[PDB]
Enzyme design. Sequence first.
Site, PDB file in Angstrom:
ATOM      1  N   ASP A   1      -3.900  13.665  11.934  1.00 14.04           N
ATOM      2  CA  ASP A   1      -4.490  12.738  10.930  1.00 14.04           C
ATOM      3  C   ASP A   1      -4.897  11.457  11.656  1.00 14.04           C
ATOM      4  OD1 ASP A   1      -5.440  12.436   8.319  1.00 14.04           O
ATOM      5  OD2 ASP A   1      -3.617  11.213   7.684  1.00 14.04           O
TER       6      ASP A   1
ATOM      7  N   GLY B   1       0.812  -1.219   0.000  1.00 13.52           N
ATOM      8  CA  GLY B   1       0.000   0.000   0.000  1.00 13.52           C
ATOM      9  C   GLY B   1       0.841   1.262   0.000  1.00 13.52           C
TER      10      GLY B   1
ATOM     11  N   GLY C   1       1.480   5.439   1.924  1.00 13.80           N
ATOM     12  CA  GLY C   1       1.443   6.287   3.139  1.00 13.80           C
ATOM     13  C   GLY C   1       0.851   7.668   2.855  1.00 13.80           C
ATOM     14  N   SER C   2       0.970   8.598   3.813  1.00 14.48           N
ATOM     15  CA  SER C   2       0.700  10.055   3.645  1.00 14.48           C
ATOM     16  C   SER C   2       1.673  10.664   2.612  1.00 14.48           C
ATOM     17  CB  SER C   2       0.792  10.776   4.977  1.00 14.48           C
ATOM     18  OG  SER C   2       0.391  12.132   4.839  1.00 14.48           O
TER      19      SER C   2
HETATM   20  C1  LIG Z   1      -7.920   3.573  -0.880  1.00 18.83           C
HETATM   21  N1  LIG Z   1      -6.827   2.652  -0.536  1.00 18.83           N
HETATM   22  C2  LIG Z   1      -6.312   1.988  -1.753  1.00 18.83           C
HETATM   23  C3  LIG Z   1      -5.752   3.329   0.226  1.00 18.83           C
HETATM   24  C4  LIG Z   1      -5.754   2.994   1.732  1.00 18.83           C
HETATM   25  C5  LIG Z   1      -4.332   3.186   2.358  1.00 18.83           C
HETATM   26  S1  LIG Z   1      -3.396   1.677   2.523  1.00 18.83           S
HETATM   27  O1  LIG Z   1      -2.108   1.908   1.957  1.00 18.83           O
HETATM   28  O2  LIG Z   1      -4.191   0.594   2.036  1.00 18.83           O
HETATM   29  N2  LIG Z   1      -3.180   1.427   4.107  1.00 18.83           N
HETATM   30  C6  LIG Z   1      -2.258   0.428   4.668  1.00 18.83           C
HETATM   31  C7  LIG Z   1      -0.872   0.600   4.062  1.00 18.83           C
HETATM   32  C8  LIG Z   1       0.217   0.012   4.946  1.00 18.83           C
HETATM   33  C9  LIG Z   1       0.244   0.689   6.316  1.00 18.83           C
HETATM   34  N3  LIG Z   1       1.446   1.543   6.477  1.00 18.83           N
HETATM   35  C10 LIG Z   1       1.625   2.841   6.065  1.00 18.83           C
HETATM   36  N4  LIG Z   1       2.832   3.285   6.294  1.00 18.83           N
HETATM   37  C11 LIG Z   1       3.507   2.224   6.886  1.00 18.83           C
HETATM   38  C12 LIG Z   1       4.955   2.323   7.143  1.00 18.83           C
HETATM   39  C13 LIG Z   1       5.788   1.254   6.843  1.00 18.83           C
HETATM   40  C14 LIG Z   1       7.141   1.313   7.112  1.00 18.83           C
HETATM   41  C15 LIG Z   1       7.636   2.446   7.681  1.00 18.83           C
HETATM   42  F1  LIG Z   1       8.976   2.539   7.877  1.00 18.83           F
HETATM   43  C16 LIG Z   1       6.849   3.516   8.015  1.00 18.83           C
HETATM   44  C17 LIG Z   1       5.501   3.452   7.729  1.00 18.83           C
HETATM   45  C18 LIG Z   1       2.662   1.144   7.036  1.00 18.83           C
HETATM   46  C19 LIG Z   1       2.911  -0.186   7.662  1.00 18.83           C
HETATM   47  C20 LIG Z   1       2.472  -1.338   7.001  1.00 18.83           C
HETATM   48  C21 LIG Z   1       2.767  -2.573   7.552  1.00 18.83           C
HETATM   49  N5  LIG Z   1       3.498  -2.749   8.666  1.00 18.83           N
HETATM   50  C22 LIG Z   1       3.942  -1.636   9.271  1.00 18.83           C
HETATM   51  N6  LIG Z   1       4.817  -1.561  10.316  1.00 18.83           N
HETATM   52  C23 LIG Z   1       5.070  -0.230  10.565  1.00 18.83           C
HETATM   53  C24 LIG Z   1       4.385   0.547   9.692  1.00 18.83           C
HETATM   54  C25 LIG Z   1       3.651  -0.334   8.848  1.00 18.83           C
HETATM   55  C26 LIG Z   1      -1.037   1.458   6.592  1.00 18.83           C
HETATM   56  C27 LIG Z   1      -2.206   0.586   6.174  1.00 18.83           C
END
Ligand SMILES: CN(C)CCCS(=O)(=O)N[C@H]1CC[C@@H](n2cnc(-c3ccc(F)cc3)c2-c2ccnc3[nH]ccc23)CC1
Length: 292
Positions: free
Chosen positions: A126, A14, A16-17
Amino acid sequence: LRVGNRYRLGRKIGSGSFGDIYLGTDIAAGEEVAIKLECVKTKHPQLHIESKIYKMMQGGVGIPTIRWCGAEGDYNVMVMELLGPSLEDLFNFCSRKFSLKTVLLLADQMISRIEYIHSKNFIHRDVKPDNFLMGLGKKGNLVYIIDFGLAKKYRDARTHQHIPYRENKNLTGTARYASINTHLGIEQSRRDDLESLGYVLMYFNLGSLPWQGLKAATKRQKYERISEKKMSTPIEVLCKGYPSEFATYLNFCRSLRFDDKPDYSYLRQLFRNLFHRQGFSYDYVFDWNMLK
Ligand SMILES: CN(C)CCCS(=O)(=O)N[C@H]1CC[C@@H](n2cnc(-c3ccc(F)cc3)c2-c2ccnc3[nH]ccc23)CC1
């Protein structure tokens, strides 16, 4: 592709911001990780700014651990311990219906995460279901907060000087969960993170919010229409048919002065007392845990 000599970058899970999220592997330790990539040649660089905020939050309950931060090829890189689905994803997966017990379990932890962030001199700005992830494995009972892309200091670390009251400010976060003050263009502070949590909890209760899915010409017009609906929906109308605690919470947030330190304790105890009246036990069995 290799990353930081010991991370293998998986598939894009996915976004991020700012920047994109990949599901990689710590080859060396045999753990799955999350990797945020940002183009080095991007006009608005943030990841390094974000990284320094995640570094100040380290050791907090419900803050993801940074594994590694670097530059590699065309990308600035942050590697985090892998977390589970967001509350938006779990909510979609539960047909946009949470039991009172799940809402109260979540609210208790979420107030606590927001309070930890405020304790490190930052506001989030947010607060929304997408920026709370459940852990995996033994951490599957922990709500984590993520994404400090829109975050900001509200007090000087040393002097605890609150930022000044400012007006005429772009709605920067997500319109749906924005505080009434935020819509009026007032500088976000602690009370606003908590008001937003309040609209997030009522969203969990209702399946949607009354100001959700409003048609208009532009994004600018839609925000005005959301503001107008929020301000013309009394708190006792929003929360009709749900425990008084949700209303009491939102009223308390709407009462907070710009530079007030909120009574996080009081607000937790609000939902804790209701939890105990309802005869629920704190056993971290959420609705999605009961799926089979
Ligand atoms: C309309 N639709 C299509 C859009 C919805 C938004 S989404 O993209 O589906 N939402 C998910 C995306 C992954 C998640 N996420 C976002 N940033 C990190 C992150 C990862 C690494 C980092 F260094 C900093 C931050 C993450 C994330 C994902 C999985 N394990 C994680 N352990 C720590 C952050 C994170 C938020 C949930």
